[PDB]
Amino acid sequence: MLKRFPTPILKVYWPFFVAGAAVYYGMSKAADLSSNT
Amino acid sequence: ISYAAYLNVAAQAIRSTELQTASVLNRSQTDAFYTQYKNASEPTPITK
Amino acid sequence: LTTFSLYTIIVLLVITSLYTLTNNNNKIIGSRWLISQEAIYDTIMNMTKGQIGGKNWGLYFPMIFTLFMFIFIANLISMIPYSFALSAHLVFIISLSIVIWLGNTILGLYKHGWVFFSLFVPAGTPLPLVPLLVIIETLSYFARAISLGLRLGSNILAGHLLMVILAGLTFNFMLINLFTLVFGFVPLAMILAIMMLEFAIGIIQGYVWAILTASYLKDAVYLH
Amino acid sequence: MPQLVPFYFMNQLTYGFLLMITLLILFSQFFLPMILRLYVSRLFISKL
Amino acid sequence: MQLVLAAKYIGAGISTIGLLGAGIGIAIVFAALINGVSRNPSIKDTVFPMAILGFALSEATGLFCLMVSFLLL
Amino acid sequence: QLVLAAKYIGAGISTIGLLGAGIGIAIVFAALINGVSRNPSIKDTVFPMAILGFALSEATGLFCLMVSFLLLFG
Amino acid sequence: MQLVLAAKYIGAGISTIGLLGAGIGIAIVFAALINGVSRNPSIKDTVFPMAILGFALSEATGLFCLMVSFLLLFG
Amino acid sequence: QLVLAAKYIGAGISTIGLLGAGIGIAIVFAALINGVSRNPSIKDTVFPMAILGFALSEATGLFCLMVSFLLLFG
Amino acid sequence: MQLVLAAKYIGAGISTIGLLGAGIGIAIVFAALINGVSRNPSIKDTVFPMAILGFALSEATGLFCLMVSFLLLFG
Amino acid sequence: LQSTLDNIQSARPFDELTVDDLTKIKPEIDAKVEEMVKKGKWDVPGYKDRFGNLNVM
Amino acid sequence: NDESILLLTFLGFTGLVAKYLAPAYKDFADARMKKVSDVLNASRNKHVEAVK
Amino acid sequence: DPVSSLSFEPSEKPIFNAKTIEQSPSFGKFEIDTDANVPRDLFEYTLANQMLTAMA
Amino acid sequence: KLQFALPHETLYSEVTQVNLPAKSGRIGVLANHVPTVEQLLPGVVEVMEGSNSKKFFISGGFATVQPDSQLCVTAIEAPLESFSENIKNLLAEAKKNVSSSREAAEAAIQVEVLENLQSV
């Protein structure tokens, strides 16, 4: 039913994942700042 | 006056100008006097 | 656990059933359900083949497909009349747009250097307004960051709130004397029509996401 | 919808981004190639 | 009290103005339809779904205005 | 009396909304006359479509009118 | 106090006016779609994504008006 | 207080400016479709023109919006 | 004084209404460009300068408007 | 060839069979799929000219 | 209940879907299934000819 | 039709009506105004243009 | 490629710039042009192949850009130098003629030609 094959995705989507980490960190601080309302 | 009849009068006018030849004038001249026909029946020979 | 956490789980399990229990163990002729997700596959394949150049379209084709399917399911489940939104937590949708926008700009910077900023000189124009045409292009260029998300977010949020507000109004409208119970089918029919519209415009928004963030990638992957 | 502003945002967003990585991998490695399998199988039958 | 309630009523009144744009819009979709169909004849079966779509989208903008009116009341 | 005053004002503002439908109605019928004069014979098919559009353009104005009454009355 | 609350509600109403332009806008893109498609009978496959694009972009402007309406409405 | 009220009023007024830009975007896209339907094939030449036109129309709208935000937030 | 300060912020908003006109104007120039170039696809090199001139002038009317908003905002 | 004609009649999935069984009978299936997955092309050349593509655009 | 009105509209929507769409989608699916089968059987014929 | 300098084959063709112009499909792949009297003019123009050739 | 064709004077059977007076006002054709069908009105025509320009007086006809960039121009007769004084004399007669004298329509066409002559 399901055929798992390796797709190059780490070496395709690296700037996306890096951008994800920065915004993730920024949302930790944003959540903390919004809970101070 | 059909579209091509409209063009026809214009063409006829255009060859008169100073320079234009007899063969043009002949292309603008016609000897045919269309003998209209009808279902046999035949309205008399009349100029085209 | 959180209601939000539970609905992210519910979405994952729904999507799994669409690709496991969609074909009778695979046969040549296949099954009727998988024809739907075949046509979707092809109309988004031929769409990003229509947008993005190279075979780089197909390198970003899984991403453009799970951006279709996520939004397609999360604007169907959230329209169930006792279901708790994921998409109406705007912070996930807006963040996802900004992440993709930054991942396009970084991808563009990596791929096309600092001549990435030559993208914002679009064309040869009279020289005293070549910089003008950079300034009010770039201002709008990072308006692209929030526009993509905020379109989808506003539509879905407004759809759910619209339905609930009209339900609350017709409830208290039909509360009064029995002459309002009589002929309270015409406002009910109006709400039914509005509810029909909200499913449609939610499926349109998932598609609109996937064409627009193909257009942003068209610019980023191939300059001009 | 009842709760529109929590302050539970980073908690929410963590499960959200987790769902994104999960679905991305799931589609890319599993579910896209089984559709590509139908295409190729059909084309191989068409060929032979 | 009086002022806030007054403002609620005022805000609702102002909101009707937003709807007008959609109203003109709807007419434009149908005008295009009538012109198109009369021009082609045969386009109509393809074109009519597209026309319904354009109508629906226009209507949605107005709906947003309408719920804001109710909220302000 | 400020609340009562506001009701009468609010009704007035709501009336503005109707103008758009008035132009709109005309636009559909303009298209009708143009189309019908262009084709001649399209009319039997097109006329149901025309009435539908005509009604819809009016309906936007009707919403504006209903809100006028809602304010005016309360 | 009363005045600030009043002002928020008023400002929201005013913001609703902004949406009208998007309303006309969507129709204009669709009108062109109909006119083009009736002209060709066959342009549609190229034109359909273009038409959707124009719709979305035009729409987004009205949405901006709306969110400002919400910002003022809620405060 | 009067000033805080005035910010909210001012913000509302600014939002009106956006309507014209919205119409503007539609006009460019209408022309895109008309041009493509006219040529069958102008699309690739016209596409950078269309993006350019979109951006410039949008920019005027964006100015209305940022002025609105500036007044709202302060 | 609160009244005067208010007048600047209110008046700024009012100025922004004018800006809508410029938004429509730019689009009209572009509309002509696309239709025109379609009608003769070789006119483009002549027409594109004319178009940029028309854009610039239309934008300028918007600029003057936006300046009056900025004068109230920042001075 | 006599054998080949007989072989085609009594063995051939002329109704249907598992597509996995087609992979089992020819690794060519997996070979073409693997090269396309490795390439990242999801376009199958000529699949749309001898099967549909069901475009909604 | 407020939200029970919404549930009635949702029931009407799913009814309209089962009325209109489920037979249409059946027909759509059917059309495609036939086409796949027909291509398949065509290839089967094709190779039988070649042997002869 | 004067097929060769030593032969002649009598030949016929159908003259295109205004109706032809109207309902020909890739008439839409040419462009002129919908208020053009071009079918009613072009019919006439090609009535003669076809005929003149036939005579020639 | 350009094509000017006449039943007995077939001419240019694209040529750089062509300037035509057409039922659609005046039309210029340059390179690829959208494929049109236009009845050519009685005309003063300029056809330019390179910067060199050739000047035609054309009796009206039909114009058709074919999609393959063949500008089919068909006209009866043209060749504007040929058109050039006796025609003015005739046109004076034609002006007299319209007043009394289907002949009225003919003489009206002659007046149209007179306008075209004044253009020359």
mmCIF file of C-alpha atoms in Angstrom, chain A residues 1-5 7 27 31 35, chain D residues 7 9-10 28-31 33-34:
data_model
loop_
_atom_site.group_PDB
_atom_site.id
_atom_site.type_symbol
_atom_site.label_atom_id
_atom_site.label_comp_id
_atom_site.label_asym_id
_atom_site.label_seq_id
_atom_site.Cartn_x
_atom_site.Cartn_y
_atom_site.Cartn_z
ATOM 1 C CA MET A 1 0.000 0.000 0.000
ATOM 2 C CA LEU A 2 2.681 2.497 1.101
ATOM 3 C CA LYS A 3 6.109 2.578 -0.512
ATOM 4 C CA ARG A 4 8.562 4.554 1.575
ATOM 5 C CA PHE A 5 11.368 5.872 -0.565
ATOM 6 C CA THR A 7 13.325 11.808 -1.172
ATOM 7 C CA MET A 27 7.246 32.822 19.315
ATOM 8 C CA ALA A 31 4.047 34.037 23.995
ATOM 9 C CA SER A 35 1.018 36.626 28.711
ATOM 10 C CA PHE D 7 -1.587 32.932 25.940
ATOM 11 C CA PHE D 9 0.573 30.296 21.940
ATOM 12 C CA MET D 10 3.998 28.668 22.111
ATOM 13 C CA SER D 28 7.066 13.283 0.561
ATOM 14 C CA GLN D 29 8.435 9.847 1.404
ATOM 15 C CA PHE D 30 5.222 7.803 1.544
ATOM 16 C CA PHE D 31 2.159 9.200 -0.120
ATOM 17 C CA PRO D 33 5.310 7.969 -4.521
ATOM 18 C CA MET D 34 2.302 5.615 -4.272
#
